[PDB]
Amino acid sequence: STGSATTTPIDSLDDAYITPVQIGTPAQTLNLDFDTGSSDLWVFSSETTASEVDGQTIYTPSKSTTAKLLSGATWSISYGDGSSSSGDVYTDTVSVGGLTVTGQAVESAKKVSSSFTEDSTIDGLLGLAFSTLNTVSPTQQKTFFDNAKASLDSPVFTADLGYHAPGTYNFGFIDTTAYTGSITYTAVSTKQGFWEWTSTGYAVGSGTFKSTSIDGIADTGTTLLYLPATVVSAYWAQVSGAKSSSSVGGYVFPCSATLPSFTFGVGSARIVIPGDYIDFGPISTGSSSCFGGIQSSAGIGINIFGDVALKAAFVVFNGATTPTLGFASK
């Protein structure tokens, strides 16, 4: 079996992407943020604290004939940006673009942090990292991808994110019309539970390629590209007037500047991120200072290939016995 769903940016900056998901019987459609950096399927629900809901579509397990309360199970998650949520667990039927999984753990939020309340367009998250990161206690639960795996024609999912435009998440197959040239595959380490891989280097604009190992994670749930301080400094040194600002919390640049492109290596292949993708607009309404899409990972502890990098390529997440990541130009 296969699945295919359109993913759409939530705003004009591509801060996040939402994909419609059918949960329960009869179907209750919620717009979820597909996150390859986490492993919990959690949703806003009829149980969420009323004051912490501001425009989101909620899941109502009492209206679903296939919803079962997972007796005694709880969940609690803390994200890298300081956001969090927790609650109880149900099992229900979940479908993504025609691909159906019965008995999927649907984590019902009882409490959510302000950053989720403020994002009215995001009804929850669908975790696509390895199931070892799932927070359900006392019995850990599997991700949607892990449950669909045996039914899929091929144990893969692909991410084709659009730049200021809709894109696609495919499950079970590789659309050969979605990319140009060849797909280059690279090894994945599952030791930390992420789609962790090693980039072979970088180039800034039309500069010389610098061969250097950059260990990082392919994360659809993170907006920006977080790279080592040395790399980020070399990129922003090519933008006249750019500087790191402690009040803003990162590199800012004059909104009138032209940004050079950024190239990252995948084995012997190169993925070029156009400079326009690195512009995240004014730091505040009316400001002539713009926020950069390439920031330092020194305060995070891990390098993150977020939406800025992934949207410049067709990305294959191969969940075979030995996982690999494929990258192709598009």
The closest of 20, 225, 3, 4 to 121, measured between CA atoms, is 20
In angstroms, the CA 275 to CA 63 distance is: 48
Q: Which two tokens stand for residue 228?
A: 């080592």
Exactly one of 3, 37, 293, 323 binds ligand U1H (CB under 6 A); which one? 37
Contacts of residues 152-157 at CB distance under 8 Å and 24 or more positions apart, as own/partner, are 152/1, 152/2, 152/99, 153/1, 153/2, 155/318, 155/319, 155/320, 156/316, 156/317, 156/318, 156/319, 156/320, 157/128, 157/317, 157/319
C-beta closer to ligand U1H: residue 11 or 153: 11
Of 5, 67, 122, 183, the one binding ligand U1H by CB under 6 A: 122
> Which stretch, 24-32, 114-122, 226-234, 273-281, contacts ligand U1H (CB under 6 A)?
114-122
Q: Which is nearer to ligand U1H, 120 or 151 (CB)?
A: 120
Active site residue 119: no
Q: Which is nearer to ligand U1H, 83 or 289 (CB)?
A: 83
Question: What residues numbered 206-225 form the site for ligand U1H, per CB under 6 A?
Answer: 221-222
Binding mask 278-317 for ligand U1H (x = CB under 6 A): ----------------------------------------
Q: How many residues bind ligand U1H (CB under 6 A)?
A: 14
Neighbours of 211 (CB within 10 A): 9
Q: Does 119 bind ligand U1H (CB under 6 A)?
A: yes
Peptide linkage before 26 cis (omega within 30 of 0): yes
Q: Which of 83, 100, 131, 140 binds ligand U1H (CB under 6 A)?
A: 83
CA–CA dist 179, 324 (Å, integer): 18
Note if 35 is an active site residue: yes
Find the part of the chain contacting ligand U1H (CB under 6 A) among 70-78, 113-121, 144-152, 227-235.
113-121
Q: Are the beta carbons of 138 and 73 closer than 8 angstroms? A: yes
CA distances from 311 to 15, 292, 303 (A): 12, 16, 17
Q: How near is the Cβ of 293 to ligand U1H at its closest, in Å?
A: 16
Query: Mind telling me the catalytic residues?
Result: 35, 199
Judged by the rule CB under 6 A, the positions of this chain that interact with ligand U1H are: 16, 33, 35, 37-38, 79, 81, 83, 115-116, 119, 122, 221-222
